[PDB]
Structure formats: C-alpha cells, structure tokens
Design a protein around this nucleic acid. Structure first.
Ligand SMILES: Nc1nc2c(ncn2[C@H]2C[C@H](O)[C@@H](COP(=O)(O)OP(=O)(O)OP(=O)(O)O)O2)c(=O)[nH]1
Ligand code: SF4
Ligand SMILES: [Mg+2]
Ligand SMILES: [Mg+2]
Lengths: 868, 186
DNA sequence: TGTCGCTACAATCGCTAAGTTCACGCAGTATCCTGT
C-alpha cells in the first residue's frame, strides 16, 4: 500500500489551489524496468499559527492592565469568541505547545506556551499585526503551504520519499505517467540511505530570426540532445548524450532550397521539418511530452530561450501550452516580470538549468557568453553564424544543413559544459545541504539557501521562525603595506575559515547574543551551550575540510581535482554567505548586530596576531582581514619552513578552534598597494627542489577592463622584474620590450582583438540614465540598435576606442570590433592606447622600481614625456 | 605782422568769427583746441610769423596765472605744427568760410565756427546791435542768415561796417575778409 | 519578483573655486594731427 518515489521539484499556486502542493519525481515501475516520472498532490496542507498570550488581561482600546492572569483557556476563549467570529473561520484545532524564540520581535520571551491553531488553507488568512486582550502576537500568519509542508515533514532536499495510503485522481492533473493523491501531510515520510536515480536531461539550442516588422523573435530551428539515464551522484557519462532530435522550419515568406528533402534524408538524422512555426512548436511540445525530461539545460534559457518559446507559443496559439511543464493548466502565466519566475512557473515540475547562471556561480571568466565559456572550459573554438547569414541560410541545402549542425554543436557544447563543471551533482549536494527546492538552487543566489538551512535548523529544535519579510557596519582591517620589492623569502600565513571559525569558537548565535533593537553587543558568556548557527556552520566547515583532505590524495585525475576544487570553493562561499546573510537587510534572519560582532572579533584577532608576530622580532608587511605577510630575510627554504611552523604553532596556541596554516612562500614579491601584489609562489618539488609559479593578486593585469595589449605588456614586465637577472639587464629588457610594443602599436601590427576592453552591465541598456554615456553602455545600445539578440543586465561587452574625427572625449568613442571592421572612417586610436592603456598600467606597476619613471615609459612607448 | 596791431584788427578788421575768438581769448587768455587751431591758422593767413604767434600766445596764456614753461612744453609743438614746422611739416592752410560753416560745431564753452551759422538769431541780433549797426542793416543780415546765406550775411556786415554800398567780392574765407578790410581801410 | 557581506583602487563626470588672460581702463610721459 506504500508508495516510494524520488521527488525532484515542488510547485504550489498560492491563489489557484489553496493548501495543495505538487511533488514531481521519479518512481520505479518493475514492468517497464525503468524509472517513470510521477506527480503527487499533497492536499489539505492546513495552515498553522502560534499565539503569544499576555501576562495579564489588557483592555484593547484603553491599553490597560486589568491584572487577571492570562492562561491558555482564556486565550482559546478569546480566539473562539471574538476572532473566530470576526474572520469567518469555522473549524480549527487548538492545542497548547511550548516553543522557543530568539529573533527580532520585542517583548517575546525566550520560551513560552502558545495555543497552536490550525485550519484549512481555504479559510481566510489572519492579519500579520493581529492583537487582542489575551494575546500580544500571532505568528506564521503568511506561511506558504510549501514551506509549511516541507518543515512539517522535515524534507531536506531531493531524496527518497515514502507515501502512505495513496489514492488515484478523478481526472488527470499532470502530464506525468503516474499520479497519486495524498489526503494529509502526515501520510508523507522520508526514507534515507538510498542512491538517487538517474534522471532525463534535455539540452536544447535554438536559432531565431527577429521580425523587425514587430521586432518579434521567431524560432527557425531547435537542436536538442537527450540522455535518459544521467546520474545525479556519479561522474557524467561519456559520451554525455544517448540520442537526439532536430526540428527545422522555414521563414514566413521564404522557401526551402530546391532539394532540401534529399539532403535532409542523406543526413540520416531524426530531422523533422515543420512547415510553419506553429507546426514546429507543436512538434517540439510533443517531443518534450514524449521524453518528459526532468532537467532541461540551456544557455540564457531563463532570460531568452524559454521566454521566446512561450511568446511564440502564445502568438501562434499552440493549444497545449502546459505540456512544456508537467501540470495541467489552461491560462498561461503573464509574461514579463523580473527574474525567471514566469519561466520557472511555466515550466513547473521541470528543473531548468541555465549554464550561464551556473558558470557565473561556480567559476570566474572574463566573459560569460557561450563562446568564451566554450574556449575556457572545453578549450574549443566555436563558429558563430551572424544573423544575416541565418536569414541567408534559406538559399542552399549546404548552408541550411550547416546552420542546423551549428545548432546541434551548440547544444552539444552546452551539455559538455554542464558535465565538465559538474553542475547537476553540485546542485543536488547543495540542495540536500540547504534543504530548499532544487530549481531555486539552480536559479542562483545565496539568500534562499542559507535562509532554508537556518529554517530547517531552528524548526527541528522547537523554535518559531519569523514570518517571511513581505556599509551598515564595519568590516575587516587591512594593514598598511610596506610598498617595495623584496627579493628574499616572504612567508604568507592565512587563517582557515576565519569567520566560520569565529562563529564556532565564540558561540555566536541568535540564542546567545543578547542584542538590542550602532553598538557591538557583548560577547556571549562561555557558559552557554553551543547555539544553532555554530552547529550548522561547523557542519559546513567540516564538509569543506573533508573535501580538502580528499584533495590531498596523490595521483588524482586532474579534471576530478579541479571538480573537487570547485566543490570546496562552493562550500567556502556557502559558509561565508551564511555569515553574510546575517547582514542582509531583506533577509528573514537580519541580525546585523551579529555580523558586526563577528567582524569586530575578526579585527581584534588580526590586531592581536600582528602584535604577536611583531613581538617575535619578525617583520610584518601586509595583511587583509585574515592573513599576514612576513619578511623572513632568509635565503634557505628549510629555515623558512622551520620559522613558519614555529610562528604558526605560537599563533595557534592562543585559540580553541581557529587554526593558522602556511598559505604560501614567495621567493620574490612586488608589493604595490593594498590588495595589489605579484609574487613568485614557491611549490616544493622534493629533495630540496622547488618549482616557482607566478601569482598575481589585484593588479590591473588581472582585470577584464584593460586592453589585452596592456595585460601582455604588464605580464612581461612583471616576469622581468620578478626574475633573478641582474637589475641592469632587467631595466634594459623592459626598455627594449616597451620600445618593441610601441613600434608594434604605431605600425598597426598588433592583432585587433588585443585592443578589446571588456566592461559588464548592471542594468538594461535603456534603464541607464543619461549620465553622459558610459562607454560599454554606448556600444550596448548599438548592439540593440542592430538586428541581433539583445544585451541585458550582467552582460560583458567588448569595445574598442577608435578615431572617428569627432574631436571628442575617449569615453564617447567606444566602438564594437565589427563596427571598426565595417566602417571605413573609423581607425584605432593608437595614441590613446599608448598613453592611457599601456602607460598607466606599467607606470603603476614599476613605481617602486629604480631606473623607470613615467617619462622613461612614455619615451620608450614613443610618447611625449611632457604630459607625464 | 605785429602783435599790437592784432588787437586793432580784432576791433575793426577781424570777421565776426575771429572777432568773437579774439574777444574770448582776451577775456580768458586761453582757447580750447578747436579755437586754438582755428585762430592760429587765421593768424597764419594774415601773416603772423611762427615766432610772432608763439610770442603772442605765450604772453597771453601767461596772464591766466599759468607758467609759460608749461606753454613751451605743450603749445609750442602745436604752434610749430599748425605752421607746418614738425611732424608731416605741411604748411596747413587757413580755413575757408565753407569749412567754418561745415567745420566742428562748437559746444558749451566753445567759440569757434561761423557766428552767423552757430549763433542763435537772437544772439546775432544782440551782437549786431552792440556793434551799432543800423537797424535796416541788421534786418538785412538776419534775412540773409535765415535763408542760410551766411556768406552773404557776412558780406552785408562787411558792407555796413566799411561804409561801402557793395562788397564787390564773394566772401569765402575769414582771411579773405581780413584782406578786403585792410584794402578798404589802408 | 528576489536581490550574501564589507574594503580598496582606478577612471570619469559634474561643479566650483583658484588662477590666468587680458582686455577694460586709468595716473605719468612721449610723438604726430587737422586745408587748401
Ligand atoms: N560574506 C562574505 N564574506 C567573505 C567573502 N569572501 C571573504 N569573506 C570573509 C569571510 C572569510 O572567512 C574571510 C577570510 O577570507 P578567505 O578568502 O581567506 O576565506 P577563509 O579564511 O574563510 O577560508 P580559506 O582561507 O580559503 O580556507 O573573509 C564573501 O564572498 N562573502
Ligand atoms: S562768413 Fe566767413 S568770415 Fe564771415 S563770420 Fe562766417 S566764417 Fe567768419
Ligand atoms: Mg583564509
Ligand atoms: Mg587739449
């Protein structure tokens, strides 16, 4: 009679169906000998509130204190007589329950007894500011049915579920294969210690041509790759895809080449040619229904792809729209609106993966457009079809098949990127750790993850969490650097998980710090028991430490090693975000005093560590909120290691959990400013043999907002400076290279891409006020002016500042590379680059270098020293 | 020409323009630039030498309680010039009656120009009465003036003052008036 | 509809003050001017 299935996504409609939550997942049917998607509708998910009684009865209008003690019988009497009648709630279940509370609502005791009342979600919801003579507060008034269900059944991320007494739906409600109705939340349970089942992943890439008559983007091809047994706890399979399908259509007026049919047949692929975009969308929806993929992956799927799909579905009036998801509906959600909420709701029951968002979250790259990601991750070169060529493709079989195969290659690259970064396993792991829904986790962001983590923690400990909410404080201390060049050994010490360790050690928690609603609250007494937040953050830190130790194993697959590094970085960022969300104005758990206390303790620790190291007769040259740089003034590495171990032991001696470890040993350093240095990191090879690896931190060479010519020049200059060559040879080589680069720039022999400069976007190109015209924004608008996919917020744009005869400021001459290659009146501003991209960076880099000055750099660049 | 006889000329021979200029100079012992230029050119026309004019002007200007050193400093160069002694060194010619009529119009504190043109009819009548001119002669001169016949009006003055029925000459120059007066008298 | 935290550096734009040009002028001195 039981019913075991592995749930993946949950969807609730607060307005349409009250007190109903749908769980979508996979269920094993023996007959098919494979997993089949199933949907379970948990009905009658009642709504629960909590009432805080007064100490003595109080007149509502007089605001008096009659003196009559208030007990739970009186509270029930008041809610039964006044409130129940007023708000038209008929049946409710009342009980006395003792719960804990430590959050931001004044005059709420740490522990008290409340009259827990539940009633059907169809009944009206009580006002958030409700009050009465017998009670001073009502909680959980606006609690979402999904949240109530998840916290009531202690469901924490995707996992195997056991359902009791399943029933069948009168009429179909979902597009899945098996459906089941649960009459009560109590009938759903969780079973542990079973591997997740492989799921179906569908990677789709489409090509669209805009209808400038309406500027509406019409789809003309959809290349889709599918694998039906993609694992969620093992490595990605090779090849990543099992089978595939391609659908190709024609424009509104244009026609197919003569023998398109013969070429398509010779292609031997599962190509289905749709006469009209209506037929193409119908075929695509039928294919999605047949495969019923559980994880749809794509590039800009949340911003462009799904929105275009839904818009064209609406325009062509394709009957069964809801088949794009897994539930049955009739009216498509209104489009527009920020975020991908329209997309996610439209695709309810399917986990949408946007490799753009996932890549932004996991790794750091100069640009997030698909070609750059492909070159960086997969180390491959992508051929891009301009939209004009896409329009021109309906003129020959060869070009039409090339376009379709390019769509197929784009889909394959998207799937390859998803597998390489290991996006799905990491999403599953982080969702299990946090306890939220997987789709939200893959949507990006840290707030919801930490909020749900703490929700689960507190709920399991008999707490009442606050209702969802319908440089404020000091930070770290950066020591003043001793700018200069150090040719001896530098010892870098870094604290391990500093803020998490502080939270653990000092027992900082909502239930330990007695706050007050900008003074730093006192440290909690050492007598108190460990709080909830130290426990959760300790679990996260322990998981990260386990992963790091696993990374220590010798002879590991380097790709697997990089995946482990990504996972460790993700866990580190999760813990740091757990800290940060305490200081997030919009967070459910805003505890700015706690964050201020944490940062204050960090500053105190750093000051004490600096004092200790200086008291050891050792030079201190730098430190950024958890780290210290020491000048060993030694040339032997063994002695350096001995001193490092000494000082590390002395520092660790003063703490219970915080540990200091040797981050790195720099053979040479060029300390320029705060958060800006380059060093020759030393990684021992064995038997006294060490290998030197360059390491740049914060310089302009490691910023995407500089022309790659400048980056190359700075990299060479740093390489010369940090080398062991005699100083005269170093200066001579610097001068010679600078002269060569100046000649190359003057003669136009540099490749054009080296003049590109990348700047991201913060808002939509239109929403930017008329604050003159920010260079990138300028070009951004041009991109939207032209007939191509628009550039929205958070998009990198590469512009080249070029001569145009305008005698205007450089900021106002930003141009795309295609613009320069097209227009015959635009030429690269060589002087601008030589004076404002090459000179500034090298001049800043070589400030502490003897023999080099602004005038000399200008001369070797061929410029006029006058302005310098 | 001699300095002393200049007074006699001003009494009798000088035309009403130079007559008024001389009266103003002997009342004030100083002339503005326009008056100085005009009177110097006229004295050049009659024949007064550069030395004689310099001496006369120096002596007259000194009587206004001013240094003759300042005069030698300032008016010496001008007196040199108006006789064409310095600068362009051109023997600048005395003004003709047409120029005097069309020359710079005098303003308050000025006395240059042709009195017949730059004097109001009442003032001209009063001046003529002062000169004991017969009422008929004054009326004829006024009639000539009203029709803008200032040359003819001056010829009438010359006829009346010299006791000659007809002028016999077309008066077109103050120095010409001076020469005609000298011819009739001497 | 959600949107982790703070600190530091670099570049650019706006606005405004400080400074510069520099043309107003003056006090002092000088030369060269006007018609027939
Ligand atoms: N909220 C927040 N805090 C951060 C972030 N990055 C750094 N911090 C803070 C909290 C970290 O504990 C502290 C020390 O920086 P680190 O990069 O050395 O990380 P941590 O020491 O925690 O661990 P690690 O040295 O990498 O093993 O700086 C961040 O992105 N968000
Ligand atoms: S007409 Fe000639 S001479 Fe007579 S007052 Fe006039 S300017 Fe003098
Ligand atoms: Mg650290
Ligand atoms: Mg004068």
């Amino acid at each position: 009679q039981v019913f075991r299935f592995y749930w993946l996504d949950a969807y609730e409609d607060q307005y349409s169906q009250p007190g109903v939550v749908y769980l979508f997942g996979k269920v094993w049917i023996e007959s098919a000998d494979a997993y089949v998607s199933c949907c379970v509708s948990v009905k009658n998910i009642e709504r629960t509130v909590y009432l805080l009684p007064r100490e003595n009865r109080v007149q509502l209008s007089t605001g008096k204190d009659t003196g009559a003690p208030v007990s739970m019988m009186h509270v029930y009497q008041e809610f039964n007589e006044a409130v129940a009648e007023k708000y038209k709630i008929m049946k409710f279940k009342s009980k006395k329950v003792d719960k804990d509370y430590a959050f931001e609502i004044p005059d709420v005791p740490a522990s008290s007894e409340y009259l827990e009342v539940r009633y059907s979600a169809d009944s009206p919801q009580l006002p958030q500011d409700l009050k009465g003579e017998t009670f001073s507060h009502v909680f959980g008034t606006n609690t979402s049915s999904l949240e109530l269900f998840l916290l009531s059944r202690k469901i924490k991320g995707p996992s195997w579920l056991e359902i009791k007494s399943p029933q069948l739906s009168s009429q179909p409600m979902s597009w899945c294969k098996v459906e089941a109705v649960v009459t009560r939340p109590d009938q759903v349970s969780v079973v542990k210690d079973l591997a997740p089942p492989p799921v179906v992943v569908l990677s789709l890439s489409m090509k669209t041509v805009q209808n400038a008559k309406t500027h509406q983007n019409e789809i003309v091809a959809i290349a889709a790759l599918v694998h039906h047994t993609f694992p969620l706890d093992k490595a990605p399979p090779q090849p990543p895809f099992q089978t595939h399908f391609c659908v190709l259509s024609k424009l509104n007026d244009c026609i197919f080449p003569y023998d398109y049919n013969e070429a398509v047949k010779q292609k031997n692929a599962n190509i289905e040619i749709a006469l009209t975009e209506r037929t193409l969308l119908g075929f695509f929806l039928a294919k999605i229904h047949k495969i019923d993929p559980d994880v749809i992956v794509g590039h800009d799927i949340y911003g462009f792809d799904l929105e275009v799909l839904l818009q064209r579905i609406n325009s062509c009036k394709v009957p069964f729209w809801s088949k794009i998801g897994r539930l049955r509906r009739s009216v498509m959600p209104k489009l527009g609106g920020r975020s991908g909420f329209a997309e996610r709701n439209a695709a309810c029951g399917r986990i949408i993966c946007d490799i753009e968002i996932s890549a932004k979250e996991l790794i750091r790259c100069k640009s997030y457009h698909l070609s750059e990601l492909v070159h960086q991750i997969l180390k491959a070169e992508r051929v891009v079809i301009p939209p004009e060529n896409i329009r021109n493709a309906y003129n020959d079989s060869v070009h039409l098949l090339y376009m379709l195969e390019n769509t197929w290659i784009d889909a394959k690259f998207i799937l390859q990127i998803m597998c390489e970064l290991n996006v799905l396993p990491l999403a599953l792991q982080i969702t299990n750790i946090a306890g939220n829904v997987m789709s939200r986790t893959l949507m990006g962001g840290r707030s919801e993850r930490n909020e749900y983590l703490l929700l689960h923690a507190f709920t399991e400990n008999n707490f009442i969490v606050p209702d969802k909410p319908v440089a404020a404080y000091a930070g770290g201390l950066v020591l003043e650097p001793k700018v200069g060049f150090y040719d001896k050994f530098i010892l870098l010490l870094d604290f391990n998980s500093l803020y998490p360790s502080i939270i653990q050690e000092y027992n900082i928690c909502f239930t330990t710090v007695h706050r007050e609603a900008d003074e730093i609250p006192e440290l909690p007494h050492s007598d108190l028991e460990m709080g909830i937040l130290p426990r959760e953050i300790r679990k996260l830190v322990e998981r990260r430490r386990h992963v790091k130790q696993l990374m220590k194993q010798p002879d590991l697959n380097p790709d697997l090693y990089l995946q482990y590094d990504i996972r460790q970085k993700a866990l580190k960022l999760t813990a740091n975000s757990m800290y940060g969300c305490l200081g997030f104005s919009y967070s459910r758990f805003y505890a700015k005093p706690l964050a201020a206390l944490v940062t204050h303790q960090g500053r105190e620790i750093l000051l004490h560590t600096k004092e200790m190291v200086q008291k050891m007769n050792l030079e201190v040259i730098y430190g950024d909120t958890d780290s210290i740089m020491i000048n060993t003034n030694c040339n032997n590495l063994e002695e350096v290691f001995k001193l490092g171990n000494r000082v590390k032991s002395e520092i660790n001696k003063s703490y219970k959990l915080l540990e200091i470890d040797i981050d790195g040993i720099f053979k040479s350093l060029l300390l320029l400013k705060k958060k800006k240095y380059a060093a020759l990191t030393v990684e021992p090879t064995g038997d006294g043999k060490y290998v030197t690896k360059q390491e740049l931190k914060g310089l302009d060479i490691v910023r995407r907002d500089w022309c790659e010519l400048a980056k190359q020049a700075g990299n060479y200059v740093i390489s010369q400076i940090l080398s062991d060559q005699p100083r005269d040879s170093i200066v001579e080589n610097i001068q010679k290279k600078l002269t060569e680069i100046g000649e190359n720039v003057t003669n136009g022999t540099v490749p054009i891409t080296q003049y590109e400069i990348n700047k991201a976007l913060t808002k939509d190109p239109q929403d930017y006020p008329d604050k003159k015209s920010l260079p990138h924004v300028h070009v951004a608008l041009w991109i939207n002016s032209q007939g191509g996919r628009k550039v929205k917020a958070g998009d990198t744009i590469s512009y080249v500042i070029c001569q145009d005869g305008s005698n205007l400021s450089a900021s106002q001459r930003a141009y795309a590379q295609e613009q320069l290659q097209k227009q015959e009146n635009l030429s690269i501003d060589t002087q601008y680059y030589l004076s404002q991209q090459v000179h500034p960076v090298v001049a800043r880099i070589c400030e502490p270098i003897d023999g080099i000055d602004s005038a000399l750099i200008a001369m070797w660049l061929g410029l006029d020293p006058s302005q310098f | 020409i001699s300095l002393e006889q200049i007074d006699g000329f001003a009494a009798k021979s000088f035309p009403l323009c130079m007559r008024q200029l001389h009266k103003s100079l002997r009342e004030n012992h100083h002339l503005r630039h326009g008056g100085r230029m005009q009177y110097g050119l006229f004295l050049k026309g009659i024949g007064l030498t550069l030395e004689q004019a310099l001496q006369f002007w120096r002596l007259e200007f000194t009587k206004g309680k001013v240094d003759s050193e300042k005069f030698d400093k300032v008016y010496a160069y001008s007196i040199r010039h108006n006789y064409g002694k310095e600068g362009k060194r051109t023997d600048y010619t005395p003004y003709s009656c047409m120029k005097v009529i069309l020359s710079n119009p005098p303003s308050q504190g000025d006395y240059h120009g042709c009195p017949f043109r730059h004097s109001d009819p009442e003032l001209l009548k009063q001046k003529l009465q002062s000169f004991k001119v017969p009422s008929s002669g004054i009326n004829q001169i006024l009639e000539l003036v009203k029709g803008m016949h200032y040359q003819l009006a001056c010829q009438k003055y010359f006829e009346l003052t010299h006791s000659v029925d007809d002028c016999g000459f077309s008066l077109n120059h103050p120095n010409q008036y001076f020469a005609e007066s000298q011819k009739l008298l001497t």
